[PDB]
Amino acid sequence: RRDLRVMTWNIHTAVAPDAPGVVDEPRIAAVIRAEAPDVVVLNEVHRDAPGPGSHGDQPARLAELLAADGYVHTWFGLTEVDLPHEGAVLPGSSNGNVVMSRHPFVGGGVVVPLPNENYEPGGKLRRSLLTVTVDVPGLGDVVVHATHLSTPGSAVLVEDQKEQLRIVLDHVDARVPSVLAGDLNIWTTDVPTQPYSQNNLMQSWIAEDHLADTWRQVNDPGAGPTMTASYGRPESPHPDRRIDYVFATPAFDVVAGHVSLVDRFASDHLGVVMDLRLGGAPVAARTVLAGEDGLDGWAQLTASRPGRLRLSVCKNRGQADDDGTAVRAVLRNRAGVALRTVTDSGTSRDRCTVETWRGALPPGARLEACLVGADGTILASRTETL
Numbered sequence: 001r002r003d004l005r006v007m008t009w010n011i012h013t014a015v016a017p018d019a020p021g022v023v024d025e026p027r028i029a030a031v032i033r034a035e036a037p038d039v040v041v042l043n044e045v046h047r048d049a050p051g052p053g054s055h056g057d058q059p060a061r062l063a064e065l066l067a068a069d070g071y072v073h074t075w076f077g078l079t080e081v082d083l084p085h086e087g088a089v090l091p092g093s094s095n096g097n098v099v100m101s102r103h104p105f106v107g108g109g110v111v112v113p114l115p116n117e118n119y120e121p122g123g124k125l126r127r128s129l130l131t132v133t134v135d136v137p138g139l140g141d142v143v144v145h146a147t148h149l150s151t152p153g154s155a156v157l158v159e160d161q162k163e164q165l166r167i168v169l170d171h172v173d174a175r176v177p178s179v180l181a182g183d184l185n186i187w188t189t190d191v192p193t194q195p196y197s198q199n200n201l202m203q204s205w206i207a208e209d210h211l212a213d214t215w216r217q218v219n220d221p222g223a224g225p226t227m228t229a230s231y232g233r234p235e236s237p238h239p240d241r242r243i244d245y246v247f248a249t250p251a252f253d254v255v256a257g258h259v260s261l262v263d264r265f266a267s268d269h270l271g272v273v274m275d276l277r278l279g280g281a282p283v284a285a286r287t288v289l290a291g292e293d294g295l296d297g298w299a300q301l302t303a304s305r306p307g308r309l310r311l312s313v314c315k316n317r318g319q320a321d322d323d324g325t326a327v328r329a330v331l332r333n334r335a336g337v338a339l340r341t342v343t344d345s346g347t348s349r350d351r352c353t354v355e356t357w358r359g360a361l362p363p364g365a366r367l368e369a370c371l372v373g374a375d376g377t378i379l380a381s382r383t384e385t386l
């Protein structure tokens with residue numbers, strides 16, 4: 001069978017917001033055990049030598065706690081050494097991203113450093129990408145990319161987020177089944193209180209690279225903020241604080257997903273648990289961005305055997321308030337006749353519009369993505385032949 005459950009979680013070094021000063025790997029492990037993912041990506045896992053505030057060897061402890069549950073394949077991808085602990089640099093400390101899996105790796109993990117040149121020219125490394133292939137029974141090889149980007153704490157940090165993301169995306173091959181997961185530290189849309197926010201731009205790059213935001217395919221983004229403290233708060237900006245993601249390549253369909261509420265106060269982030277299903281090899285995958293500068297959303301078309309078509313259309317505009325605009329995708333024949341139209345309205349807090357049907361792309365077909373005004377006027381249009 002073709003199901004895959006993928007979880008991502010920033011575990012805050014297993015220190016719970018409801019119990020400061022206690023390192024509690026069992027609480028983290030119990031949530032993972034209950035969610036029973038095939039593969040889990042963890043951020044903020046330390047591997048520290050002894051000293052004031054040390055977290056010890058967290059990957060080894062998590063592996064010990066989860067071995068009997070089948071998570072016997074683990075990889076730690078170093079991101080940073082010698083971090084402040086309790087107000088002082090702790091020698092021999094380190095942070096990593098971790099992949100844990102019930103299924104064996106093919107080869108080993110590879111770590112790619114991600115720069116912070118704008119924040120600190122010539123400074124220490126702080127962020128990295130971990131890539132490892134997992135051989136999943138029934139599916140075959142799935143490439144897992146695990147990362148954690150800088151926080152958007154300033155204009156220079158956002159410039160670093162952009163450079164980090166470029167490198168991450170250039171390491172994803174959408175031609176093979178892959179997932180990209182972790183704390184990307186970006187909303188899907190520009191933060192209105194930050195003039196230097198460039199989230200719409202970054203999301204357009206991810207979509208151009210044939211990656212689908214899996215949560216947004218099946219759920220309202222506004223129902224899944226991933227900061228624990230934001231969960232359950234309808235007031236702005238809380239429903240927008242979804243910053244932990246699972247992205248998937250076109251071969252995957254998204255079945256369902258949820259934020260983990262087994263023990264919500266175990267970390268200051270919520271775990272994101274996605275149920276995916278691997279289809280056949282895509283025969284075509286194309287993204288057309290929407291809006292005059294390609295910043296208002298997108299349409300992603302996937303064709304696969306036998307004769308299946310999928311169109312995922314996303315309006316990536318607005319937070320609390322719907323301006324009445326819509327993103328519309330039209331599949332047209334060579335004559336320009338509409339074969340199918342799929343539209344997404346609402347705001348970035350609302351689920352994307354995904355349609356799947358039986359059909360074949362005729363020769364000379366093209367895909368159009370438009371931004372449509374509230375009055376029905378076409379504000380922008382972009383078309384690409386297939």
Ligand SMILES: [Zn+2]
Nearest residue numbers: 046048054055
């Ligand atoms: Zn530590």
